Design a binder for this molecule. Structure first.
Ligand SMILES: O=C(O)CCCC[C@@H]1CCSS1
Ligand SMILES: [Zn+2]
Ligand SMILES: [Zn+2]
Lengths: 336, 336
């Protein structure tokens, strides 16, 4: 019963690994929700609190810039650095109020976006040098479009600088090298980063497009690692499921059983969030200033009907429920 | 040319007074725009950076609570404290990117809501002792429902507590005491607060209901003030204009002429923020999960169209251009 299931807010350092080790010990996985706004982080935070579950808010490169604003110049990664930092401070400031452990993470960052990674990394080190924690709980490199030698080598390079801050790195490997990811590719990842810190999770290629899904390959990844490590460890790696959408429970369950701790969502939530707002097209007529076809045909105040605290909340309300479904489907509901 | 005009980020201390003395000297007022999310804050920072203007972002007790999330119980003022705090950090973190001075201020706090004020002023001090600045630039107490005997006293208590941090306090006085408000009771305020510190503005009752609007009473205050103190400067009082709605440009002008520095917006930013998103009802045939009216039936992805980053942006856009119009009316545009 690690400390993490009792804490409340963003969590760092050894509390991340413990939340993930419990993940595999009690066989569930944690949703990784891509946020873009104060209101999207609200909906996951409260979906998570209501099903008394842990949660992962994450910031993609483009999602980061949105937190800054699509109108802030982003040629130099300036917006994704700034707005990702802004999201961190905001999430950190709010999350404790919802009373659950949150993993603040940054999503896909390919080789051409490493300026953004670099920015967050300086941000972290500064924060670490005053507070004792980095700014973000976790960070991801998606260098899977590079050869695996290169991909891994600069994972290690960055990982070395993150390990001094006890920070979590997530790593995506694919099918380059010089068709799925051989367990051999995945173990190569492990023996490079495991000599730096255990604080790392791997997202491997296993038919998760983003020809079909072979999540059992993830088990073979783990068994191969089990052999070579020489441990009696059922789950020698920390695994991540990208492109979780339309995966039936059959596919989620053998993935969790194969040691996945994190299943990304994004696109599903995107639609969940809209539908509640979209379902303010029922108020079609009560939304163009003063005209109301209901009582007062052109002399009503639509203030009550147009105030964004009434219709945006219909977005928060719908997104959370999508998250609760995955929260249940992933078996993370009720885990604290 | 005060240094503050060239600053960038949330301003504190006498930089605020400087902004206001500047606004009073060059005869413009700054719009105070209520925010309720990261998305809404972006819309106003963008409007200001673009029209080369300073700007005041403010959180209402309800808007504060929204920043915490409508599902955070707010029974002991708990949501509005979290939400104003996390929005304090978010705005502070993102505002320097927009490159304009921002005053972080809070909206209506009446007697029933001092818990929210206490939690916010509690965090200011704590923060002030860490960093050298409070969290928020400014706070308001609106205690006009209480006898003006009691009003002046409760602000003087808080103002002594904020003046050590140099925080700005704005107070609303009504028409009680023990029909608009007198230049006499309005001078009463100044005569007490100015002992503590110069950093206060006055929100008087002059038919800005929120029987009609008398912006000329505000020059009456400045004329009364100057005599009883005996100063030269025509504007011995910082005046703020609540509920100035659909007021003519003549009406706003005579109030700015009498030293109004800050004119509160909100509910047409509310309506303006909506319309843009509402004008994505035009895209409803491409707004159900997989069926799309335009290309190949039932088999094209509606992802592009329902990414909240394209349609919420549209709301931010129509909200900002509503702020631009305001920045023109009040003559704050292009004053940096
Ligand atoms: O934009 C202006 O110049 C006047 C705005 C009048 C309405 C105010 C926005 C809604 S609250 S009061
Ligand atoms: Zn991926
Ligand atoms: Zn008022």
């Amino acid at each position: 019963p690690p400390a993490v299931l009792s804490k409340s807010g963003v969590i760092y350092g050894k509390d991340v690994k413990d939340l993930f080790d419990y993940a595999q010990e009690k066989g569930f996985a944690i949703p990784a929700i891509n946020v873009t706004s104060s209101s999207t982080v609200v909906a996951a935070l409260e979906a998570a609190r209501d099903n008394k579950a842990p949660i992962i808010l994450q910031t993609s490169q483009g999602g980061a810039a949105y937190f800054a604003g699509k109108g802030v110049d982003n040629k130099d990664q300036a917006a994704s650095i700034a707005g990702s930092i802004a999201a961190a401070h905001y999430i950190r400031a709010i999350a404790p109020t919802y009373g659950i452990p949150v993993v603040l993470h940054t999503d896909h960052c390919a080789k051409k976006l490493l300026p953004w990674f670099d920015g967050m990394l300086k941000a972290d080190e500064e924060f670490f040098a005053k507070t004792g924690t980095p700014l973000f709980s976790s960070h991801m490199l998606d260098l899977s479009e590079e050869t695996d030698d290169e991909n891994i080598a600069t994972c290690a390079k960055y990982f070395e600088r993150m390990a001094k801050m006890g920070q979590w790195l997530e790593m995506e490997i694919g099918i380059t090298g010089g068709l799925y990811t051989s367990p051999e590719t995945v173990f190569a990842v492990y023996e490079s980063l495991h000599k730096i810190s255990p604080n790392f999770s791997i997202a491997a290629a296993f038919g998760n497009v983003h020809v079909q899904l072979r999540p059992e390959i993830l088990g073979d990844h783990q068994v191969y690692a089990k052999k070579q490590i020489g441990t009696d460890a059922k789950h020698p790696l920390y695994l991540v499921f990208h492109g979780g959408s339309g995966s039936t429970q059959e596919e989620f369950n053998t993935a969790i059983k194969n040691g996945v701790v994190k299943v990304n969502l994004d696109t599903d939530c995107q639609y969940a969030y809209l539908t509640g707002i979209r379902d303010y097209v029922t108020n079609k007529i009560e939304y163009l200033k003063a005209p109301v076809g209901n009582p007062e045909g052109a002399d009503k105040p639509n203030k009550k009907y147009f105030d964004p605290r009434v219709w945006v909340r219909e977005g928060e309300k719908t997104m959370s429920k999508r998250i609760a479904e995955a929260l249940d489907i992933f078996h993370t509901k009720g885990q604290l």
